[PDB]
Amino acid sequence: GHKDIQMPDGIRREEFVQWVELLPDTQTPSWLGLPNNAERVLLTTQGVDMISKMLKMQ
C-alpha cells in the first residue's frame, strides 16, 4: 500500500543491526521492486514442480 521502508537514521553499526532485527518479518516481493504477484507466480511454479516430481514418483 502506501507504506514504504524507511532507512535508519543511526550512524553506528549497532543501530543498523537493531533496525534489521526490527524488520517487520512479513517480506513481500514488492520489497525488491517486483510486483506483488511474483510470489504467486513462484508458488505456482513450485506447485507444478511438486506435481511433476510426484508424477515421476509413479
Residue pair 29/38 in contact (Cβ under 8 Å)? The answer is yes
Residue 19 carries which side chain, given as an amino acid letter? W
Residue 45 CA to residue 30 CA, distance in Å, equals 19
Count of CA atoms in the C-beta half-sphere (13 A) of 47:
6
List, in sequence order, the alpha helices (H) in the chain: 13-21, 38-56
What letter would DSSP give residue 23? Answer: S
Residue 15 CA to residue 13 CA, distance in Å, equals 6
